Design a protein around this ligand. Structure first.
Ligand SMILES: Cc1cc2nc3c(=O)[nH]c(=O)nc-3n(C[C@H](O)[C@H](O)[C@H](O)COP(=O)(O)OP(=O)(O)OC[C@H]3O[C@@H](n4cnc5c(N)ncnc54)[C@H](O)[C@@H]3O)c2cc1C
Lengths: 160, 139, 61, 614, 111, 102, 154, 7, 51, 71, 161
RNA sequence: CCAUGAUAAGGAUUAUAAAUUGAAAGUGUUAAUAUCAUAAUCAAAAUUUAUUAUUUAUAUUAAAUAUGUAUGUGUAGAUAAAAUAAGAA
């Protein structure tokens, strides 16, 4: 669910800047990208104006591609991780299996045997645990080990 | 009022709206539209690597063409050879009697003005002359 | 603000405010008071007078 | 200070190189016939002086033709005789400047005749410009108004002997010194030229009816010959070096000093536009754009729409009451006043339209009524010429007819309220609002306003006349002052329209109240019974109709008898006093537009007058 | 042919000539005094290249993108003057300049 | 194809390398610890190895400030061009839209 | 702020007669209430508008009441009086919104649209980067920079 | 009747 | 170069000043001289054509 | 839990969709508890309104409800 | 090709005269229309422009009022509250017979332009300055708002003992 | 040219209800009258003609070739549309 507007408003009478009504291409709809489809000033239909900006189909395609670019940039913002190849033997137990290609089988689970019901296509491993396998010749551990917090420890949250 | 055979056969049906870029009779009245920054990207092939159209070359054992095609793109040889170059246009034809080097690489339809500003004062009727005067096109 | 002479008639006559009865003996009197106060008047604002209709009739004749 | 700077720049004993008319390369084109455009005329389609210059140049003499014009600084921000009104309000000055710009554009782009604009005294500028340009013959139009007849006489006298001026001291110089000119004056202001009237002006019988009789037998010169003479200027050669360039046509750079620059309103001495701007509701949807071509288009569109009903209702031979709210009436008075549209052109166009649409039997009556109106304007011109300076004196031109008129009285508060339009009479309010906001108000509105000021209240008629001069953009001196005197009972002439009461005019012309409702929409709820007398309403009716006297609608200036005893301070609602809205309207605090506005908000004042507070 | 030569000349001269600052001095990023804010960064880091790009809107926006130290602040928060307002010469001080441009030049609104 | 790929730079791969080369020249570590295996920056797309190429832009500004054109002429599909238009839907056979071909 | 185009002003009757579309829209109403609350003044006009408008939209679907027909016209006069009173209350709310919005923009150093007035430091009206080369209401030219209503430093 | 006020 | 990519790379060297006559008072192009008879080139076709 | 069927849109934050959700919840509650039917039916919760947006028609200028220009 | 200075037929083409009017059919004038606002009547120009308020504006206002409260500057708060007190009084109920005028209806030819013109002019005249229905001035009594800044909670030090 | 017929547009009184707000009175092409009739798209084309909703000032020309014109106080006259999932008494 998104609150943004994916649809280009239909062409109708000239829209005047007022309450409830704004110009169709007033630098605010669909971001500032409407300048690509903006033709300012009074224009003679007889011998002025590019028709591709007046074609509803083309402007709908352009706003669709702009929305797709927004979605792609936000997805890549989410994608903080990177993918590294491992030859199937240094991977953890949860990966020593056959993973079907994307959009080819039922969305798999990460070993539901031990009450782990995550998505195998979305699980992300941290660098600390895989530091040894990723840098066999590094010698000294360049990345410090991840200091895990003990849940059984008696801390302030447990009402000391 | 344009006079042609298809005028009687077909009907304009008023100011009907056609699909985008799909009008039946193409009349590129904007071929001669000038644009200095977009000189090489207006009414011309999009890619500079593309070869010249087939209409710029002679294919078979021809005997002679009265006029060359509009899409034929002006080249250096058109001016250097000093031959006869003609392009079909209203009313009859336009002949390149002033060979210039500033139009090399542009299409002849782009060079020729489709909608000529000149208005004939001879074939104009009394009512039509009055209409043109009222519109301001004629004194 | 100018005044007006109470003895001689000035060149510009200005009407004094009208007096209306503070008590009404009859419902007919109350209705007349409302009618002449304009309570029962249409709130429409005149934009074209009957003179236009009369001129149309005269031209038609 | 701007006038002093212009005098130092142009009127110096030696003209600087930055302000020099370029020397003609052709010895035969060195001489050029000159024509000067006055404020009376700003047209080139029927002006007599331009045609005479064209025919003289094509006959012999200097083939080039040079057009000049001078915008005087003495009639824009200077105080009037009394009341300190602008001789031309900011609106009128804007209209005049726009007309001048349109005329200059037409002259320099169609006829290719340069128009040299100067700012300052025409008597100082014109003869020196003629000497500098080496003009053979200088043509102009006859000016016969006060402050204008004298400048015309000074100009012709100076150019007769090739006299000069010298900066501030104005030391006249001789022809010999330098850094056969003859002046021709042609009469073109009136519809019918002098010497064409069936009776001489000196022996003309005093009365508009007799002139209406005369004009039927009078003849009007056709404009085709003059149009041909003007058109010949296109083939006639002219000085091309003075033609405008593309840059100065577009306004990228200021025009060269020798070609001149039109003055700006701020520099002319107005100073505080926010004080003089009026923010009120405008009801009329028709406005007159400056320009002779615009005037011609307006005449053609009015004839096509059929505005003859304004002249006379169809089938009504008797003259009928006008309707000011309507858009049908022809608003050509500003054009006729500014000279953009010639009365001869108006008459010939109207006669052509009538001849075309002669099938209807009433168009002849419409045409004759319009010709009667034009003849009335000409009659007022002749009356102004007959009276001369005697008209502008106190108590009108003819004091013997003003025995019944009481002694004039002067009240700054009363005249300020009348000018602002805070009168209790809705008809007077609407007339004043139209006169102030719009370019002009109708004839009935002018009559009502002037009668209310002069006779209704007792204030001096010159105050109302000068306010009409300030506001009405269709201002003609003789016509305005003569009508003011007639409707103030200063020129008491029989066999003419009777002077009528303000109440009479309101009840007659605007009976239903459409005009009053349109121009004072806050009174829209008032029934047509009480539209013209909102003062006579009880508290109950005021509450039910949503208008409170004083708080919302002002009380009338002239109260009824006994009102002073029964009215308290709260109801009166003084509008002009210390700390009031009118006082704080202007940034400098000197009140606002109205009484002594030229003295209060005038940066440059040539005359001292009297300047005192309250 | 004559008009095409003139239009090419005018377009090249317009492209080479310096234009006005394309950023609005009335909005959040370009509001600080010239001695503070993003103006210090502009004057001490990217001042040299602004003269080389001649203050055209596309190169200045691209340089602001590439310089970093601003992030998305040039689009999410910053605003720029319109297309016909950003093409005025270096010193204009007048609104009506855009209508003073030559009309016989067929440069498609590029002075 | 657009967007065009700008010319590469040596030490723009990571902040460590950028600081080491362009900021101080005294940074001890040359670059971030690179795993011995191959890292696919653009995971869905298999790009030709040894070729300089970009990745989908993280920032919004570059998306609308890049040299990305817009649709001007009619839209052409590699297969849908046989069907003239959405209005002129050319169907060879009156088969079901949910029909399957086993 | 983001809307810098010259705008056309509709009559207050035209604004009010619009139902829960723009004038009575809950999103705009709650935004105005939040602005009033942040300023710390009571929302009496806004609440008086809301209590009328929610009942109006609740009863908009049903038919008008059957009436025998008042000879004196008292019922019609009372209905007109109530309608006018509600309209004037909504007028007061509209004016309050259009005044406090300008005041808040002036306090926050927000440049408004073309041809509008902020009582703080812009009484003539603000015109900047308009399609016409003049104020279009004073017919006076404007400098190439729009204007500087506020100082530079924040 | 939607809103009624004592004053 | 077209405007959409980089106008700043345009330089005066691109313009052939000898092809047209330039006004002195305005910098406009008054006229363009003939460019056919005086034009001499050694490669009307690319050198690899060789007829 | 609510499952959307028919025409799916990103944001359904509109009064029509809210009415549809209300009707679905009321019907589910009636099916779950029988005696709940009386208050909901008397308050009109269960009643369905047959109103729908006018279908497209190219003869109209916008396509829905406005004709074309007449001289 | 050495463009000759003498064009035979190119110049002689009856150049089109400049457009006279504007708008529809190039015949609209430059009259001051009904869109003109009055910047003198009240702090807000009448027929106000459609100003729309955004949540970022609300956040900026919250930050500004936080800064003002933390810095102790209360003159803006006092002036805002006084302005609200002056403009936010309860409208008195109109007396019987108070109704805004309506435009007459005709069936043969309804002029919608005049219909909207009358409404616009009437509302333009109906400025907030002359809104007699809304109580204003110092003579009114407001038993809902604090009359002076002295009794506001920011001056709490005074009310002691 | 003329050479029989035939479909359209054009809302004013049969209503709530378990329901649709588009008509038959006729619109170029179609089936009997004849008596020089080769007028027909397969591209790149020639406004003078009633019956047609165009994008208005942060970012603007890449693929079949596709619009260089008109900034001028939301501005005369004349005129168009809607009471159906919308909000009007
Ligand atoms: C106090 C006063 C001052 C006036 N000042 C002027 C003035 O400065 N300029 C001016 O042209 N008229 C003046 N008049 C005359 C009258 O006001 C105008 O003729 C008319 O009202 C202008 O509006 P119109 O063009 O729509 O009238 P129309 O009747 O449509 O115009 C017809 C033309 O006839 C002439 N005309 C008609 N009636 C008169 C008249 N009574 N007196 C003189 N000429 C007339 C004018 O040239 C006018 O333009 C004045 C009248 C009065 C009572």
């Amino acid at each position: 669910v998104s609150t943004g507007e994916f649809d280009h408003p239909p062409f109708q009478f000239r829209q005047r800047h007022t309450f409830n009504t704004t110009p169709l291409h007033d630098a605010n709809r669909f971001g500032g990208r409407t300048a690509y489809l903006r033709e300012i000033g009074p224009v003679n239909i007889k011998k002025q104006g590019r028709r591709f900006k007046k074609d509803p189909r083309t402007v709908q395609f352009n706003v669709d591609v702009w929305c797709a670019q927004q979605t792609l940039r936000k997805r890549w913002k989410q994608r903080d991780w990177e993918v590294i190849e491992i030859p199937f033997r240094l991977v953890p137990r949860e990966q020593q299996r056959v993973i079907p290609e994307l959009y080819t089988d039922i969305p798999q689970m990460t070993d539901p045997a031990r009450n782990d019901f995550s998505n195998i296509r979305n699980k992300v491993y941290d660098r600390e645990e895989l530091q040894g396998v990723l840098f066999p010749a590094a010698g000294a551990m360049l990345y410090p080990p991840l200091q895990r917090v003990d849940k059984q420890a008696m801390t302030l949250d447990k009402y000391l | 009022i344009a006079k042609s055979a298809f005028g009687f056969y077909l009907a304009r049906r008023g100011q009907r709206k056609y699909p985008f870029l799909r009008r039946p009779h193409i009349k590129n009245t904007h071929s001669m539209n000038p644009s200095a920054p977009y000189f090489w990207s207006f009414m011309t092939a999009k890619s500079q690597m593309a070869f010249l159209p087939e209409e710029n070359y002679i294919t078979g054992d021809w005997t002679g063409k009265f006029f060359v095609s509009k899409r034929q793109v002006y080249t250096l040889q058109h001016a250097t050879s000093g031959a006869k170059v003609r392009v079909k246009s209203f009313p009859s034809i336009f002949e390149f009697n002033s060979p210039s080097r500033w139009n090399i690489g542009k299409e002849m339809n782009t060079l020729t003005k489709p909608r000529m500003d000149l208005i004939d004062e001879q074939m104009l009727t009394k009512k039509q002359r009055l209409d043109y005067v009222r519109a301001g096109l004629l004194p | 603000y100018l005044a007006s002479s109470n003895s001689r008639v000035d060149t510009l006559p200005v009407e004094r405010p009208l007096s209306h009865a503070v008590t009404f003996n009859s419902d007919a009197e109350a209705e007349d008071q409302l009618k002449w106060e304009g309570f029962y008047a249409e709130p429409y604002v005149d934009q074209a007078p009957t003179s236009d209709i009369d001129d149309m009739a005269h031209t038609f004749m | 200070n701007y006038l002093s700077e212009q005098d130092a720049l142009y009127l110096s004993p030696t003209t600087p190189e930055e302000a020099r008319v370029p020397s003609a390369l052709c010895p035969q084109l060195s001489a050029c016939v000159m024509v000067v455009f006055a404020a009376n005329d700003m047209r080139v389609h029927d002006n007599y002086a331009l045609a005479l210059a064209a025919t003289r140049a094509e006959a012999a003499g200097g083939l080039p033709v040079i057009a000049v014009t001078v915008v005087d600084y003495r009639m824009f921000a200077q105080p009037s005789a009394v009341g300190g009104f602008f001789r031309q309000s900011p609106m009128r000055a804007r209209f005049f400047l726009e007309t001048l710009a349109a005329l200059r554009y037409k002259l320099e782009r169609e006829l290719r005749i340069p128009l040299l604009v100067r700012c300052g005294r025409p008597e100082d500028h014109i003869p020196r410009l003629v000497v500098e340009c080496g003009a053979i013959d200088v043509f102009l139009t006859t000016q016969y108004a006060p402050h204008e007849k004298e400048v015309h006489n000074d100009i012709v006298e100076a150019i007769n002997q090739r006299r000069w001026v010298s900066r501030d001291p104005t030391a006249g110089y001789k022809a010999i010194e330098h850094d056969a000119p003859v002046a021709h004056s042609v009469w073109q202001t009136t519809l019918v030229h002098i010497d064409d009237l069936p009776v001489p002006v000196a022996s003309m019988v005093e009365g508009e009816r007799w002139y209406h009789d005369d004009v039927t037998t009078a003849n009007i010169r056709p404009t085709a010959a003059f149009d041909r003479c003007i058109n010949r200027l296109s083939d006639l050669p002219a000085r091309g070096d003075l033609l405008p360039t593309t840059g100065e046509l577009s306004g990228l750079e200021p025009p060269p000093l020798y070609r001149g620059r039109a003055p700006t309103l701020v520099e002319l001495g107005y100073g505080s536009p926010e004080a003089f701007i009026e923010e009120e509701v405008i009801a009329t949807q028709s406005s007159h754009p400056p320009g002779e071509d615009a005037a011609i288009e307006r005449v053609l569109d009015w004839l096509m729409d059929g505005g003859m009903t304004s002249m006379l209702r169809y089938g009504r031979d008797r003259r009928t009451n006008t309707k000011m709210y309507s858009q049908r009436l022809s608003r050509l008075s500003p054009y006729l006043s500014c000279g953009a549209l010639s009365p001869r052109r108006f008459y010939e166009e109207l006669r052509r339209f009538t001849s075309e649409h002669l099938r209807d039997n009433f168009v002849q009556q419409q045409y004759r009524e319009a010709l009667l109106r034009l003849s009335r304007r000409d009659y007022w011109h002749w009356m102004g010429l007959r009276y001369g300076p005697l008209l502008f004196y106190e108590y009108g031109p003819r004091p013997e007819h003003t025995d019944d008129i009481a002694d004039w009285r002067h009240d700054p508060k009363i005249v300020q309220k009348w000018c602002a339009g805070l009168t209790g009479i809705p008809f007077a309010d609407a007339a004043m609002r139209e006169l102030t906001l719009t370019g002009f108000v109708a004839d009935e509105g002018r009559q009502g306003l002037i009668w209310l000021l002069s006779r209704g209240y007792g204030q001096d008629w010159r105050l109302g006349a000068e306010w009409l001069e300030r506001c009405s953009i269709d201002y003609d001196p003789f016509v305005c002052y003569g009508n003011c005197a007639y409707y103030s009972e200063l020129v008491r002439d029989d066999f003419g329209e009777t002077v009528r009461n303000i109440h009479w005019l309101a009840h007659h012309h605007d009976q239903t109240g459409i005009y009053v409702k349109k121009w004072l929409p806050q009174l829209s709820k008032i029934p047509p019974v009480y539209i013209h007398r909102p003062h006579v309403l009880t508290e109950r009716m005021q509450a039910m109709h949503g208008v409170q006297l004083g708080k919302n609608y002002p009380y009338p200036l002239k109260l009824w008898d006994g009102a002073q005893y029964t009215l308290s301070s709260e109801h009166l609602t003084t509008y002009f006093s210390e700390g009031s809205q009118w006082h704080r309207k202007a940034k400098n605090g000197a009140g606002g537009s109205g009484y002594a506005e030229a003295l209060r908000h005038g940066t440059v004042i040539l005359e001292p007058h009297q300047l005192q507070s309250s | 042919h004559r008009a095409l030569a003139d239009s090419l000349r005018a377009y090249v001269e317009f492209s080479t000539s310096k234009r006005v600052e394309p950023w609005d001095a009335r909005f959040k990023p370009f509001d600080r005094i010239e001695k503070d804010g993003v103006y210090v960064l502009m004057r001490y880091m990217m001042e040299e290249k602004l003269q080389l790009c001649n203050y055209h809107h596309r190169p200045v926006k691209r340089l602001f993108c590439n310089i970093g130290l601003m992030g998305p602040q040039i689009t999410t928060k910053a605003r720029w003057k319109p297309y016909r307002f950003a093409t005025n010469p270096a010193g204009t001080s007048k609104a009506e300049r855009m209508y003073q441009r030559d009309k016989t030049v067929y440069t498609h609104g590029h002075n | 194809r657009f967007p065009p790929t700008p010319s590469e730079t040596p030490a723009t791969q990571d902040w460590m390398a950028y600081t080491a080369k362009y900021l101080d020249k005294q940074f001890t570590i040359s670059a971030e610890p690179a795993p011995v295996y191959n890292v696919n920056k653009l995971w869905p797309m298999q790009q030709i190895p040894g070729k300089v190429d970009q990745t989908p832009f993280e920032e919004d500004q570059t998306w609308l400030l890049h040299s990305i054109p817009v649709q001007q002429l009619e839209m052409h599909h590699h297969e849908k061009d046989l069907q003239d238009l959405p209005f002129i839907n050319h169907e060879q056979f009156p088969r079901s839209l949910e029909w399957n071909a086993p | 702020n983001t809307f810098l185009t010259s705008s056309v002003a509709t009559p207050p009757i035209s604004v009010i007669r619009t139902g829960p579309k723009w004038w009575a829209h809950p999103e705009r109403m709650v935004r105005q209430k939040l602005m009033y609350f942040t300023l710390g003044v009571d929302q009496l006009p806004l609440r008086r508008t809301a209590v009328i408008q929610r009942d109006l939209q609740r009863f908009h679907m049903c038919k008008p009441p059957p009436r025998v027909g008042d000879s004196t016209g008292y019922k019609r006069s009372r209905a007109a009086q109530l309608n006018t009173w509600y309209r004037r209350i909504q007028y007061q709310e509209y004016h309050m919104q259009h005044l406090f919005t300008r005041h808040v923009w002036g306090l926050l150093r927000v440049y408004p649209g073309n041809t509008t007035k902020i009582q703080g430091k812009a009484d003539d009206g603000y015109v900047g980067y308009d399609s016409v080369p003049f104020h279009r209401y004073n017919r006076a030219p404007l400098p190439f920079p729009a204007r500087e209503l506020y100082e530079r430093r924040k | 009747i939607s809103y009624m006020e004592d004053v | 170069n077209r405007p959409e990519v980089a106008m700043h790379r345009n330089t005066v060297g691109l313009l052939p000043a000898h092809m047209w006559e330039t006004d002195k008072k305005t910098g406009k192009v008054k006229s363009v001289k003939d460019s056919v008879r005086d034009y001499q080139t050694k490669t009307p076709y690319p050198k690899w054509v060789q007829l | 839990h609510i499952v959307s069927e028919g025409h799916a849109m990103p944001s359904i934050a509109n009064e029509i969709a809210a009415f549809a959700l209300r009707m679905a919840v009321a019907n589910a509650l009636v099916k779950l508890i029988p005696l709940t039917r009386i208050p909901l039916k008397k308050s009109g919760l269960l009643s369905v309104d047959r109103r729908r947006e006018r279908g497209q028609f190219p003869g109209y200028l916008d396509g829905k409800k406005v004709k074309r220009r007449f001289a | 090709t050495a463009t000759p200075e003498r064009f035979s037929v190119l110049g002689t083409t009856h150049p089109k005269p400049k457009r006279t009017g504007f708008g529809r059919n190039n015949k609209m004038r430059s009259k001051p229309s009904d869109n003109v606002a009055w910047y003198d009547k009240g702090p807000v120009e009448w027929l106000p422009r459609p100003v729309r308020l955004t949540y970022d504006h609300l956040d900026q206002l919250q930050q500004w009022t936080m800064r003002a409260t933390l810095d102790g500057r209360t003159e803006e708060f006092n002036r805002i509250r006084d302005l609200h007190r002056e403009w936010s009084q309860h409208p008195l109920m109109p007396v019987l017979g108070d109704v805004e005028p309506k435009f007459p209806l005709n069936l043969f030819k309804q002029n919608h332009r005049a219909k909207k013109r009358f409404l616009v002019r009437w509302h333009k005249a109906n400025t907030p300055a002359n809104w007699l229905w809304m109580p204003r001035g110092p003579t009114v009594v407001t038993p809902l708002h604090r009359t002076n800044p002295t009794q506001y909670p920011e001056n709490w030090k005074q009310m002691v003992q």
